[PDB]
Amino acid sequence: FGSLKDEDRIFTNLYGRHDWRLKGALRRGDWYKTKEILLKGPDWILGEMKTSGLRGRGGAGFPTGLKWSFMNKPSDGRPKYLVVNADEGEPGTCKDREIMRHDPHKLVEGCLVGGRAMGARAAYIYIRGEFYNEASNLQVAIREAYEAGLIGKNACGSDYDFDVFVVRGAGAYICGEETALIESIEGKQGKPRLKPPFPADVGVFGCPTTVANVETVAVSPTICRRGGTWFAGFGRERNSGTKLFNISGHVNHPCTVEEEMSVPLKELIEKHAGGVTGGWDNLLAVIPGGSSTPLIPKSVCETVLMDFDALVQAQTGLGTAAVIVMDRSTDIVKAIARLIEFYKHESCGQCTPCREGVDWMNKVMARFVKGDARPAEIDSLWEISKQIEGHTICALGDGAAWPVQGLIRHFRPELEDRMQRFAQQH
Amino acid sequence: TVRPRSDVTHKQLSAFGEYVAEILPKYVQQVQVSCLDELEICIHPDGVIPTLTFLRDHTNAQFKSLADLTAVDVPTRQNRFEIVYNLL
Amino acid sequence: YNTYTFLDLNLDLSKFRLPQPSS
Amino acid sequence: SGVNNTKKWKMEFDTRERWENPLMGWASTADPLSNMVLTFSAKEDAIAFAEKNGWSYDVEEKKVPKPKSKSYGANFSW
Amino acid sequence: FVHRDTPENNPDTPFDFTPENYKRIEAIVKNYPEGHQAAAVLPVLDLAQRQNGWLPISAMNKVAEVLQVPPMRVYEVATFYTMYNRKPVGKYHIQVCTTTPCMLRDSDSILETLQRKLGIKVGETTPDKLFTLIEVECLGACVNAPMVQINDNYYEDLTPKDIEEIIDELKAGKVPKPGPRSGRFCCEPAGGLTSLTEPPKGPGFGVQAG
Amino acid sequence: PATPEQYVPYSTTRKKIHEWVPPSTPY
Amino acid sequence: SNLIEVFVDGQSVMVEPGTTVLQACEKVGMQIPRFCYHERLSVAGNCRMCLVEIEKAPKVVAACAMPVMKGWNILTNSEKSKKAREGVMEFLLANHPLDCPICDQGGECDLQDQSMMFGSDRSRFLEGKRAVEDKNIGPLVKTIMTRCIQCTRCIRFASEIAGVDDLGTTGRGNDMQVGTYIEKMFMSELSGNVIDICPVGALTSKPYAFTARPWETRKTESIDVMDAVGSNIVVSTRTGEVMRILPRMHEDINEEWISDKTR
Amino acid sequence: ITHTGQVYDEKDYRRVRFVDRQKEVNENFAIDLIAQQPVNEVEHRIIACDGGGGALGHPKVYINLDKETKTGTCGYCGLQFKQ
Amino acid sequence: PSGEERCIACKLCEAICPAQAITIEAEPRADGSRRTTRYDIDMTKCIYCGFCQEACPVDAIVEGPNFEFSTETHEELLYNKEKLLNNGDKWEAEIAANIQADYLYR
Ligand SMILES: Cc1cc2nc3c(=O)[nH]c(=O)nc-3n(C[C@H](O)[C@H](O)[C@H](O)COP(=O)(O)O)c2cc1C
Ligand code: SF4
Ligand code: SF4
Ligand code: SF4
Ligand code: SF4
Ligand code: FES
Ligand code: FES
Ligand SMILES: [Zn+2]
Predict the structure, then answer these.
(1) Which residues of D touch F13 (CB under 8 A)?
(2) Which residues carry this modification: N6-acetyllysine (chain H)?
(3) Does D26 touch chain I if contact means CB atoms closer than 8 Å?
(4) What DSSP element (H or E) covers A308?
């Protein structure tokens, strides 16, 4: 439900206030049962996540255990690998920036705890190129850990071998995709591959590979070291566990709090963070999972709590759980319009739907903000939207269509008036 | 842009096609009502005078006028020419 | 921080890294 | 890349003189059977027609592409 | 996306990794599996950018040589990513985040202030070559929606006057306290932490026999 | 708001072929 | 017998494991409309003009890259797989420059046909088109690349048949331009094949620029005499002078390709 | 000689045609008339060229006057546009 | 108006001309542009059906309002590109009025 206890808050060093470095980490006791866990077995680790029923902490939601289970199949003579994507291009995902800037070890032991679960030879962490600062913090942390012998061959005084590496991103949101990151590592252009060859079977350097949101890798060790069931209790049904929530825009105290999942949307701005700037009635709309997920208008805001099942009932996605809030002084139409501008400046262009479709919606959306376009065009953008939604090679085209669909779904009268406003002044 | 059609005809004529096929089993090789709602009784060449006489002089099927007689030539078919008699 | 510090950390963690497989 | 024009057997005749009309520079010809491309549906039915009409034939066997195995992942190996 | 050879930006310019740089080069490679030096392109191309911001056609060709890859390969990587600059950026490249999260926090409000202070249009270098302003997209520090990235400095919660203090510090002197401004630090509920105030539970706590 | 100017056709085509011009001096 | 059984609108054909959904339709005889998929070129999935709907399945799959599985019935003429083509063709055409009476791949266009058979009667793009900058790739290939549908066939051929990796994609977004970043001519034998392999008329042949138009060309099948491989070729003659020689497929000798010399 | 050559060689017997007659030859060569036209300066990177008309001119194509190095020429009007 | 021939040698007007009357062999005109070197009607084969004026995407070939052009000989009816272009350099004051008069209905 809500009011996650500090005693249950995984990322204790959030907000810093501790030594993100190892000695702070030791007081955190992050490396407490690592040898034991690995000793227990890879099968024991996946039992822990299956019991946890953790969902993907990245924009896509899938059982974390089943995804890791897939490349637990016997090696075919190719080294298995771990890829941690610290890229978070999605607006409002400062969620991950926290775990690299702070509590970097949380992720380092997440990597080896996760590594033996998939039997990965090594893990590469792709941080956003922008986070040069963040990249500096982690390898200082990674360097500490090996010096200790926590990672490396015979890591944590155990038979198992692991090596952790950090890879420089280069300002691309699409590099965040499950497969495209792999291609970026491989050194080719960051263009996603098709799903038929699933990442596990075909991978980074053509070997089995797996990709996890940094939050997903980070919570593993604590979910196993601590009781996974313990975590499970926090979640709701399929939904489970605490996921960091970032609230940004039109709220009195924008902040990232790792409060519990399944939180009433009205409650998290009202109780933690900062109540919606201007009052809870000054809420034109809420973007729950970030730019990719459709915004939900106030009417439904207070009604649904934050969890992926509840949101999909609501037609929106928990995604990165980045809450972007809009007051009534905003231009709903120009707000979403810049997100389509966010996607035309960013989609790879590999696939026909997304390439021309996202540019086509950008042109129509800019006209919509001006009000130059006629009212009949508004549903035509509906139809352009679903052509892009099911036909794209990756999910970004999936993502571009949803905000457009949300604007037409709940704010169709406002766009018509902008249509009307321009027609009147001629 | 989809023809205004009557299904009554397809059925009525289909039924006549079975009638003609039953009345003349010896000469008719295939009867089919096309989707243009027209009927085509394909007869063995020997049935040319029998089949047309039955249609010209039968109370339940009087086909008094010969609209036209023409011969499509499909060179592939062994019997190239396909004489076609349209009756009203 | 400086432009070359991130890569110098990599320069440093080379030894830390054990050997890499070859295809 | 349309394969709908490579499915029916054609019987075309030899290419004789195509010359130039002195007055306007157009292409002129005296081969009455020049624009002739009969279309059959099988080798058997074309040889039959040519033999039927007394022409000489030069049958050329069909050349369907063989099956070439294609896989997306293959280009990701190393 | 076409490199029309120009005297300044052309193959003529000689590029070569400093003895120190070449060292760095190797470090990167080994990170990748053997015989996969190809992957080194992005990280290496980055060090060519570290060496020189311009990174001219000559520099890319050099990268291809070092990693043994086909030049076109490197050219494709450089063009795809915004991080690499194929033109001479200014000494201080100021990038203002203008995605919707920041906009709603008047990120644009920052823009107008910076254009006037730099006294220049958005997208080009100052005559002084001192600063270069560009309207970059989300930088991943949405919590502090007002935000500008100055050569990694990554400042935040910036207000016209805040940027004012910052731009003056860059123009005279250096290292202008890069980071948030209001003192909200990184993602602190401004009013109060509201959480994590309780002391760390300590190692072992909650193990619950896993 | 007999005549000499009679249209006469051409072959406006640029002659579409070129014959070898034999060598000018013998061998 | 590792044949696996899969249904093409019911014909229930049996195919080797690992055949693509597009390939399964071919043996029944159906043709998936396709761009960016060439039989002897790697599958890329760029166009996604081949989206089909396997049965009782949530979304449309790419017939060029999806390995057909056991007992999936492909529905190639469903109400969905036509909205998956009526809506893609909307996009390819949206940024396309209307100069079909300039594009000498007039009747030789795999993009007007598929528009003219599987695409849409009208246009809804009431906005502004894009334009790219014509560059010089050589004296044999005229790249009026504002025509390009970014299908990456050229990039692959240049890299998988001819080993000349000079061509490549540059830039992201709608701005992706498929060409040679620096202006270096595409000099190699096997060069002219790009013309034949680009279904769009973006880059076409410069000598045969505007001498003819394909419906007129009478096509006589003959043999290559310039080189001893004896590559099969089709000589396209109009009113009695040869206008172009393009390859005709011989599995064993020239499988759809001919030399720069003999063209 | 027509704008496209065609001039008969003195020996050509194909010259009798014009005896007691003459030769229909247009004096207004479009190679030059189009050169006697001002390069259309523009502000935008890309420009249209409906052929100076909507439905009375030529199909509408957008030309990329992006390089001053080259004045885009609509393939239909032969009009050069000066960025 | 500028003076540039409108015909860009599409061959969209002999592919429809049912009387098979038109031969428009073309080249690049040495400006880099695209124009005819050849154009033709045999006016003793044409049927005045106007399938060439409605197919032309540029309004180059039209079918003017002349009907007093009888000839004492057969050769004066095989029009060339220069008896059609100066012909069109004659009636353009009289054609365009009728095009502008009927363009909407077409
Ligand atoms: C355009 C695009 C951008 C993405 N960016 C990110 C990202 O920045 N971080 C991330 O964790 N996942 C991102 N994803 C989702 C990944 O494809 C993948 O599903 C996810 O990283 C898996 O993490 P999880 O399984 O631990 O949730 C992105 C997906 C798309 C289509
Ligand atoms: S390619 Fe040439 S022909 Fe095919 S559509 Fe585009 S323009 Fe018309
Ligand atoms: S050029 Fe022809 S082939 Fe190369 S991409 Fe553009 S269209 Fe596809
Ligand atoms: S006349 Fe009109 S149609 Fe005939 S070629 Fe010239 S332009 Fe194309
Ligand atoms: S009018 Fe004369 S020329 Fe124009 S199409 Fe009909 S017949 Fe051919
Ligand atoms: S939008 Fe500027 S911080 Fe993400
Ligand atoms: S043809 Fe299937 S992906 Fe383009
Ligand atoms: Zn024009």
Answers:
(1) 25
(2) 60, 82
(3) yes
(4) helix A308-313
